[PDB]
């Protein structure tokens, strides 16, 4: 079965990596690009970008461990642990050449450690719409003069007693629509049909729990990254952020400058957190152009 | 019926104030002291303090509009709106003399405007365990290196789509236990019985909604207070805060220094947010002694 429709000419498949069955969707020919989704979603957030990239690259979009159709991690949910699975997955398809990486939201948390620990394996990097886990996350506000803040939910999801799963179980579809739209500028792209697809996936009990385990491991990820960040990233990097309601704005590039020697950043006006869906045309263009500076099919 | 047991020598009663039926528990004789509860609770949080205070004062403990056995406000849930009800209630019982005010948690939000606007009516003031709504609240962090922060709940409760009611309905007891214990140092004082009583009260649909409407009005209250704070408080004031897990620590007094000319503060080591229950004896002593400096 497939939780989301595969684009024409792509295949949905699985690869066992360190005892964990990872789902991915793959298509195209050429150098490898791996696209890594974030919270609330699955590989499917990339489905509009994938066909365009596949004209020039071999494209793989995995489901994060525990989310979509991927099994939960056997080690743990900290960035360094999850990054092992994703690095090994990518290297199965590109064992002799570096690959490109695009990541959104917690996709960043789950890839940064393998990028910094295997810099020669990463040709070009695109990060969008989330902080790399570090001390900066403790400076975000609980509450704002406009209402709910961007990341108060970090505390909700990290809370003990299974607070989040206990409250959200059975109400996943309601919760996800609120979470997504509250972090959006162009809310209209989130049709009831699209929200139904995403909600059905994360409502699987192991996926609902997995989602929150990423946040329960956040402080550990921060501790890991404090050490890792002693070495800056050397490969070409691009950051994207939304400039509209729900977006990270200038924070994305400003933090990345501390991590990367070679970074260019863009803030997309009228776009919130969900760049691939809210602002498909400009986001896809920025990504395709940036990756196409390097050798491609 | 009664949601909580009334102490001997006290009466559970109601008064209409601006078309809203307010519940309160009252006892004692002497000058008036009004005790105002906060979120997750009702007049009952004061039930241990009340008999002691009633030896020297007339004591009234109202349920906030929409909570306990009080009807929802017919105006709104902003601090200035709610304060009118509480001010007029107190004046029904103390028309000719200033009265004392003790407030905890959102009881502070719901009283500050009537205190600053009617200073001649307020003899002495005790505020514990919550910020007065102002820009300082925007500095509290969303997340900490130890896990959940103190006030991420402000965003959860203020969120639209009835986010909080929708997620919490059917799980009111579970949620309230987590909320209370996560903000406590002394969790043992919250027995299954006590938690049952508080949960049943705030689970009334209109009370569950009322609870969060106070937070949905918080930014409005901040804006209101920005104007009101141009006038400093002149009456003798005491602040209390918990020094343990869940408490506000030094914030309470430090904020109050910006508001009040005459203020003393205490931080109670080993106590969290729920001072009247977690640390009843020392809290009661400090309140009684502070208020007994005035004629009683």
Whole-number Å distance between alpha carbons of A227 and A230: 6
Backbone φ and ψ of B254, nearest 5°: -60, -40
Cβ of A140 within 8 Å of Cβ of B143? The answer is: yes
Contact B144, B5 (CB under 8 A): no
Interface probe, candidates B146, B152, B174, chain A, greatest A C-beta count within 10 A = B152
What resolution in angstroms does the PDB record give?
1.5
**A167 has a chain B CB within 8 A of its CB:** yes
Cβ of B143 within 8 Å of Cβ of A146? The answer is: no
Contact A208, A202 (CB under 8 A): yes
Residue A31 lies in a domain: yes
User: Which pairs from B194-201 meet CB under 8 Å and 24+ separation?
Assistant: B194/B277, B197/B3, B197/B4, B197/B44, B198/B40, B198/B41, B198/B42, B198/B44, B199/B172, B199/B173, B200/B3, B201/B3, B201/B4, B201/B42, B201/B67, B201/B68
Our CA angle for B4, B9, B11, nearest 5°, is 50
Q: Exposed, middle or buried by CB within 10 Å (0-12, 13-18, 19+), for B135?
A: exposed
**B261 has a chain A CB within 8 A of its CB:** no
**B159 has a chain A CB within 8 A of its CB:** yes
Residue B171 lies in a domain: yes
- Comparing alpha-carbon positions, the chain A residue that sits nearest to B161 is A178
Residue A2 lies in a domain: no
How many structural domains compose chain A?
1
Whole-number Å distance between alpha carbons of A18 and A71: 11
Considering only CB atoms, which chain A residues are within 8 Å of B178? 159-161, 163
Contact A145, A151 (CB under 8 A): no
Nearest residue, CB atoms, B140 vs list A141, A145, A154: A141
Whole-number Å distance between alpha carbons of A210 and A214: 7
Interface probe, candidates A155, A160, A221, chain B, greatest B C-beta count within 10 A = A155
- Comparing alpha-carbon positions, the chain B residue that sits nearest to A165 is B167
Classify B16 as helix, strand or coil. Answer: strand
Residue A244 lies in a domain: yes
Experimental method: X-ray
Q: Nearest CA of chain A to the CA of B185: how many Å?
A: 16
Contact B245, B149 (CB under 8 A): no
| Number of helical H runs and strand E runs in chain A | 13, 10
CB count within 10 Å of CB B209 equals 17
Domain that holds residue B19: 9-292
Our CA angle for A37, A38, A44, nearest 5°, is 45
Closest C-alpha to B156, from A140, A182, A173: A182
Residue A41 lies in a domain: yes
Backbone φ and ψ of A28, nearest 5°: 90, 180
Kind of pairing between the strands at A147-148 and A143-144: antiparallel
Residue A1 lies in a domain: no
CATH assignment at residue B92: 3.40.50.1820
Contact B270, B158 (CB under 8 A): no
């Amino acid at each position: 079965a497939e939780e989301f429709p595969v684009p024409n000419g792509f295949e949905s498949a699985y690869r066992e990596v360190d005892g964990v069955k990872l789902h991915y969707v793959k298509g195209g020919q050429g150098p490898l690009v791996m696209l890594v989704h974030g919270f609330g979603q699955t590989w499917y957030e990339w489905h509009q970008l994938m066909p365009e990239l596949a004209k020039r690259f071999t494209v793989i979009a995995p489901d994060l461990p525990g989310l979509g159709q991927s099994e939960p991690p056997k080690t743990g949910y900290s960035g360094e642990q999850v990054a092992v699975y994703l690095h090994k997955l990518a290297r199965q398809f590109s064992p002799d050449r570096p690959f490109d990486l695009v990541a959104h939201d917690i996709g960043i948390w789950n890839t940064y450690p393998m990028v910094v620990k295997n810099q020669a394996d990463i040709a070009r990097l695109v990060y969008m719409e989330a902080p790399i886990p570090d001390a900066r996350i403790y400076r975000f506000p609980a509450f704002t003069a406009q209402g709910e803040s961007l990341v108060w939910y970090f505390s909700f999801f990290a809370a003990d007693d299974r607070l989040a799963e206990t409250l959200i179980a059975g109400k996943e579809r309601f919760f996800l629509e609120h979470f997504i739209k509250s972090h959006a500028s162009n809310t209209e792209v989130f049709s009831e049909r699209l929200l139904d697809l995403y909600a059905r996936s994360y409502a699987k009990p192991h996926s609902l729990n997995a989602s929150f385990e990423y946040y329960r491991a956040l402080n550990e990820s921060v501790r890991q990254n404090a050490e890792l960040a002693k070495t800056r990233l050397q490969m070409p990097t691009m950051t994207l952020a939304g400039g509209g309601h729900g977006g990270m704005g200038t924070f994305q590039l400003e933090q990345m400058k501390a991590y990367a020697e070679d970074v260019e950043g863009h803030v997309l006006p009228g776009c919130g957190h969900w760049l691939p869906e809210e602002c498909a045309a400009p986001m896809n263009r920025l990504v395709i152009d940036f990756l196409s500076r390097g050798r491609h099919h």
